[PDB]
Design a protein around this ligand. Structure first.
Ligand SMILES: *[C@@H]1O[C@H](CO)[C@@H](O[C@@H]2O[C@H](CO)[C@@H](O[C@@H]3O[C@H](CO[C@H]4O[C@H](CO)[C@@H](O)[C@H](O)[C@@H]4O)[C@@H](O)[C@H](O)[C@@H]3O)[C@H](O)[C@H]2NC(C)=O)[C@H](O)[C@H]1NC(C)=O
Ligand SMILES: *[C@@H]1O[C@H](CO)[C@@H](O[C@@H]2O[C@H](CO)[C@@H](O[C@@H]3O[C@H](CO)[C@@H](O)[C@H](O)[C@@H]3O)[C@H](O)[C@H]2NC(C)=O)[C@H](O)[C@H]1NC(C)=O
Ligand SMILES: *[C@@H]1O[C@H](CO)[C@@H](O[C@@H]2O[C@H](CO)[C@@H](O[C@@H]3O[C@H](CO)[C@@H](O)[C@H](O)[C@@H]3O)[C@H](O)[C@H]2NC(C)=O)[C@H](O)[C@H]1NC(C)=O
Ligand code: NAG
Ligand code: NAG
Ligand code: NAG
Lengths: 410, 344, 267, 49, 49
């Protein structure tokens, strides 16, 4: 029905006003054929930073906006025309291109500062890290401030926290920047959605955080993989599959063909499988039978009561404050300070193709590894013309779970 | 459900009102679900209004009566589960929450909208715990309850009956023995008793100006509060003192006199909680085979009286007078089942 | 009065859940207890943490499975102030952590005529093995019945392997196996059982699932081999047809708006 | 504020308007209801608003 | 016709008031309560969108 299906590459989940986030969007269409550099018209709307550009070869392009706007910032791009002009009066009529229809809402910072963080939201090198980077600020510079402030970086691990690590540095009284050094390692022992967190340990009583997360793709605590005697002809019975794990670990010998698995490949059969086969991983904020609360505070006077420049009953908003940024990871906490917005209590006036090969069993058994790696003999099932595997698996408490994911013998 | 238990507890029931009440319960339950939330919660409207948030005092009532209604017939556990945990998450850092005001009626909740007695409604309604569990939610209700008690008792005025009486019965089904005792004993000082009974009253000349018709904006919550006054005394998981039973039948003489010819009382809250207070007063004093309460007086002037009370001579008033100027008539009571006497 | 206790509200009983409380800007003293003292105070998880400034000391009070469903034992948390009691209401979420299990298999699909062989696992919050019994487990026959069983089996290194038969004509198709725990955690895995033939022909088109409006040339790529290495020197056509318009076949021909014939001799 | 009558009934009351825009004032010796015999359809006295 | 019409008031602060009108008095209104009229290009007529 639609043509030219665009994207949202690395756009802001949400954003804040004192820093220009960079929008990024890509495209794919037809044969997978976005033109390298066909022009667009980048819809700066209500911030009015209209700034046309074009793709790269990937579809990708990077673009930002200016800063000076209310929460209600509406942002998008179009690439072709807008309305349904041609031969369109029949009611058996429609013709569309994709909408880059993105929105978001705004920090409620009567705290007036925040942190602006950048992503990992893509493929990942594990057992690694990188100099983590965000953008800091401070407000009125600092009104009175201090010499330093502590920035100890929370990381919501497995529905809670696991690691310990601190940061913090000087305050200059009346000048701000947006640079901050930090880094955290990617190992294991972790709910595999990487929920970083960081804030100012404020004396005047407020916190600055959000859903500002990363990824934890397939990487393991205990490793194991294999090595075998070669693909050989009919009588090559005496073979091997030498596989190597921790010193003391019960492990498997499931040497196998793979054709009848090419019929139904490893659908629920992987390390990401054993990751997400966990239950109740990150039940966050307000779960199923879970809700917000009536903070006894109220902004109730007997009339509509907005000052400033307008008659307005207390301007019914829908945006993002910090008590929900306590919700968006999954934890509770306690806090005397002012973290939640002033919503009031209402007044008296206003309220398949079947592709099978022969079935007989080849190898299925268990050994235990040693400090040197066992070299178990795979034994051949001749009269079998195909590509093969050993879907093994190992485990122990001295090392944790591990798996030989991928190998091939024809 | 409370009158179902009340009629059954008295033992003058019938399995026909029972079975047609099975029908009542199924239909009414289901129609509660007509107006609940897709998440578990409960508002007045529910379906066709997807985006919404339930009601607090409402949901307290619904968990309470889900407790007791399961306590008579079959329910499904997920309802009490999801609702108990609704009130459990109704919890940011510290505060004692208030009504998420979406009422259509300020009288169905006989209270006066303070988070004080709201929160105290939470703690009682979530501690009375018939045969299920009440895990997280209710103790921090006790915690805020102690907090508001500190705010009040450090003062001297919270309407002088209402809030501290709710503290009494809250601490009671908690069993904060010294603390329930302190607050109900202050109440015992702050006495508004009847010439034949006992009862309590908010100022009745309230400090803020009042209205015209039934004193609007204020249900006056007497039979609910005075029940919640009545309710503190009967509570002890083995037994309270018999002083509790005395004051109970005093304040319940007041209850039954404050009732009117139709049914229930001047709200639903007062009616529910009165009937349940009365029912479990009975559940203390009533057992099937226990119908053997024997009696004597023993006055030294060869002028005393033996009596007996049972299940089938179960309630004849024995109007009996005395010749002596003083009354030096030593009681005695043996057997099974409790009795109400009134001397003057 | 600054103090903030990041208390994660999600639970895994008697396994690691580390916790620390925040303070800066030294006051009189703060040593808050995120306690669990009950309605009477009988049962609690009282791991109080002191509070000192501009550091964090995280501690893992791992806590039990309580009653029928997870009971936190009447939660309360008191802020420990020397000349202050600033203190109000908040709770925790509650569930029981079984030791968590799964299945792997040779196949699901199986040929009646041979046997079956299969293994099971159990772990915890963390991903290290666990040797603890089961109440029971049994292979399911599709008719609301149980066909294999090894009752109250226990693991060896966090694992176990059996090998069960399969009759050469069972009911055809998915055959479930489930383990259930002494709480009753059901973990489900089938084995398909179907006597589908080995069809002695294969032909496999490639063709646009997505052909869209403006396109220049479609190259429908078609070669399936009856034994993956033996095609014919021959001819093939194929009913590339413009279709998908609900027809009673009143025409006598099916719903084709078009049926195109780009047939070619098979090389 | 509570006040009373001068010889004319004048009261030089002043309210500091450190508030907001849309007001709704009020002045009484009585309350927001015809305190005796309001909702009767047969009683015809009133306090001036 | 002189108008400062943003899509919405742009109050970045407590709330996102949209184009949020008012009824405050004017000196346009002082003069028409007075009654008569005048000519200037200054700021009297409030900037009604
Ligand atoms: C994204 O939007 C930006 C803002 O609109 C674009 O920036 C423009 O970039 C151009 C080229 O650097 C600047 O120079 C102008 O170019 C135009 C071109 O006019 C042509 O045709 C007229 C016909 O009479 C001819 O006289 C000229 O010689 C040109 O052949 C000139 O008309 C302007 O006078 C000026 O030299 C612009 O300043 C700048 N803004 C404008 C006016 O668009 C940017 O190009 C866009 N992104 C892309 C696709 O580059
Ligand atoms: C929208 O983005 C622009 C950047 O493209 C921001 O403008 C920048 O604002 C700062 C602070 O005013 C400028 O720094 C100083 O500007 C004054 C101007 O008189 C100059 O005298 C100082 O020496 C210093 O450069 C900065 O120049 C300016 N960007 C430029 C031209 O480099 C702007 O703040 C963003 N949004 C808004 C409207 O705030
Ligand atoms: C409300 O109605 C019930 C109707 O069942 C009244 O009878 C109660 O029924 C239960 C049934 O279990 C009685 O329990 C008994 O326990 C003994 C000892 O284990 C056993 O020998 C009996 O066969 C029976 O199971 C119970 O005693 C009896 N009364 C109660 C529950 O106090 C009940 O009297 C009525 N009152 C209420 C509960 O409001
Ligand atoms: C620190 O916090 C406590 C607890 O609220 C408060 O009583 C005290 O006044 C504060 N200041 C200092 C320096 O103790
Ligand atoms: C708390 O309850 C348990 C239930 O078994 C009881 O044994 C214990 O005596 C009670 N409190 C204590 C520690 O005395
Ligand atoms: C309003 O507050 C001001 C503060 O200076 C005070 O002077 C005044 O008396 C108050 N109200 C009036 C105008 O009487």
């Amino acid at each position: 029905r639609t043509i030219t299906k665009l994207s949202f590459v690395k756009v802001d989940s949400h954003f804040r006003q004192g820093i220009p986030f960079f929008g990024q969007v890509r495209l794919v269409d037809g044969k997978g054929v976005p033109i390298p550099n066909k022009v667009i018209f980048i819809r700066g709307n209500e911030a009015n930073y209209y700034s046309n550009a074009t793709t790269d070869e990937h579809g990708l392009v990077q673009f930002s906006i200016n800063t000076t706007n209310v929460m209600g910032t509406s942002l998008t791009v179009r690439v072709n025309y807008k309305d349904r002009s041609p031969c369109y009066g029949y009611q058996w009529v429609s013709e569309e291109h994709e909408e880059a229809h993105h929105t978001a809402y705004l920090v409620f910072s009567p705290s007036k500062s925040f942190v602006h963080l950048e992503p990992m939201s893509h493929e990942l090198p594990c057992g690694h890290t990188q100099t983590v980077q965000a953008h800091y600020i401070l407000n009125g510079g600092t009104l009175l401030g201090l010499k330093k402030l502590s920035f100890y970086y929370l990381i919501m691990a497995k529905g809670g926290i696991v690691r310990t690590g601190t940061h913090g540095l000087l305050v200059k009284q009346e000048d701000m920047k947006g640079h901050f050094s930090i880094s955290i390692p990617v190992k294991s022992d972790i709910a595999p959605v990487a929920r970083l967190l960081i804030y100012a340990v404020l004396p005047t009583g407020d916190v600055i955080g959000d859903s500002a997360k990363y990824d934890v793709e397939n990487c393991l605590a205990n490793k194991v993989d294999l090595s075998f005697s070669p693909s050989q002809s009919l009588p090559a019975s005496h073979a091997h599959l030498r596989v190597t794990a921790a010193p003391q670990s019960v492990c498997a010998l499931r040497a196998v063909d793979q054709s009848v698995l090419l019929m139904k490949p490893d659908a629920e059969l992987s390390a990401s499988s054993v990751y997400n086969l966990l239950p109740e991983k990150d039940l966050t904020g307000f779960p199923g039978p879970l809700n917000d609360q009536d903070n006894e505070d109220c902004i109730n006077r007997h009339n509509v009561y907005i000052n400033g420049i307008t008659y307005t009953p207390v301007s019914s908003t829908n945006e993002k404050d910090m008590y929900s940024f306590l919700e968006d990871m999954g934890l509770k906490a306690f806090t005397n300070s002012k973290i939640r917005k002033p919503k009031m209590c209402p007044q008296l006036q206003q309220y398949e193709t079947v592709r099978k090969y022969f079935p007989e069993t080849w190898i299925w058994d268990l050994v235990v590894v040693n400090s040197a790696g066992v070299a178990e003999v795979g034994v051949t099932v001749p009269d079998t013309i195909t590509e093969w595997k050993a879907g093994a698996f190992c485990l122990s408490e001295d090392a944790g779970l591990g798996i030989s994911s991928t190998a091939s013998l024809r | 459900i409370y009158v179902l238990d009340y009629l059954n507890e008295t033992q003058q029931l019938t399995p026909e009102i029972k079975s047609k009440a099975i029908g009542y319960l199924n239909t009414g339950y289901q129609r509660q679900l007509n107006y609940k939330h897709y998440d578990g919660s409960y508002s007045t409207f529910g379906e066709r209004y997807g985006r919404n948030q339930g009601n607090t005092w409402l949901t307290a009532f619904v968990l309470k009566t889900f407790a007791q209604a399961r306590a008579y017939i079959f329910i499904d556990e997920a309802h009490i589960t999801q609702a108990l945990i609704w009130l459990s998450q109704r919890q940011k850092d510290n505060g004692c929450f208030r009504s998420s005001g979406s009422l259509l009626n300020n009288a169905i909740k006989g209270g006066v909208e303070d988070e004080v007695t709201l929160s105290a409604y939470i703690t009682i309604a979530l501690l009375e715990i018939p045969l299920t569990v009440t895990h997280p939610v209710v103790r921090n209700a006790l915690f805020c309850l102690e907090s508001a008690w500190k705010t009040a008792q450090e003062g001297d005025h919270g309407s002088h009956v209402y809030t501290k009486a709710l503290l009494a019965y809250a601490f009671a089904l908690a069993g904060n023995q010294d603390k329930r005792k302190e607050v109900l004993k202050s109440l015992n000082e702050e006495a508004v008793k009847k010439d034949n009974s006992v009862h309590w009253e908010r100022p009745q000349k309230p400090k803020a100006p009042v209205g015209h018709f039934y004193e609007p904006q204020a249900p006056s919550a007497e039979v609910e509060m005075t029940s919640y006054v009545l309710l503190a005394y009967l509570t002890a998981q083995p037994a309270p003192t018999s002083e509790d039973l005395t004051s109970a039948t005093n304040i319940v003489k007041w209850i039954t006199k404050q009732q009117n010819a139709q049914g229930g009382f001047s709200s639903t809250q007062d009616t529910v909680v009165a009937l349940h207070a009365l029912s479990k007063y009975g559940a203390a004093t009533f057992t099937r085979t226990g119908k053997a309460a024997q009696v004597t007086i023993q006055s030294s002037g060869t002028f005393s009286s033996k009596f007996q009370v049972d299940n089938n001579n179960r309630l004849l008033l024995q109007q009996v007078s005395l010749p002596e100027l003083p009354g030096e008539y030593s009681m005695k009571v043996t057997g099974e089942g409790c009795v109400y006497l009134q001397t003057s | 009065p600054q103090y903030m206790v990041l208390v994660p509200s999600l639970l895994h009983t008697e396994t690691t859940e580390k916790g620390c409380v925040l303070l800066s800007y030294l006051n009189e003293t703060v040593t808050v207890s995120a306690s669990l003292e009950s309605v009477r105070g009988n049962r609690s998880l009282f791991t109080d943490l002191e509070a000192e400034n501009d550091v964090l000391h995280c501690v893992a009070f791992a806590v039990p499975k309580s009653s029928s469903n997870e009971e936190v034992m009447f939660l309360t948390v008191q802020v420990k102030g020397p000349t202050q009691e600033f203190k109000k209401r908040t709770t925790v979420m509650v569930k029981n952590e079984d030791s968590l299990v799964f299945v792997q298999t040779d196949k699901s699909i199986y040929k009646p005529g041979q046997t079956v062989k299969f293994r099971v696992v159990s772990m915890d919050e963390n991903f290290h093995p666990l040797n603890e019994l089961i109440p029971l487990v049994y292979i399911q026959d599709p008719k609301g019945n149980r066909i294999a069983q090894w009752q109250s089996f226990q693991l060896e290194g966090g694992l176990k392997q059996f090998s069960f038969p399969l009759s050469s004509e069972p009911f055809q198709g998915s055959y479930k196996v489930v383990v259930q725990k002494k709480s009753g955690g059901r973990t489900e895995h089938p084995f398909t059982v179907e006597e589908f033939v080995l069809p002695k022909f294969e032909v496999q088109v490639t063709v646009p699932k997505i052909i869209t409006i403006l396109e220049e040339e479609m190259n429908v790529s078609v070669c399936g081999l009856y034994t993956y290495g033996k095609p014919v020197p021959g001819h093939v056509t194929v009913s590339i047809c413009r279709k998908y318009s609900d027809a009673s076949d009143c025409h006598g021909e099916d719903s084709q708006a078009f049926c195109e014939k780009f047939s070619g001799q098979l090389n």
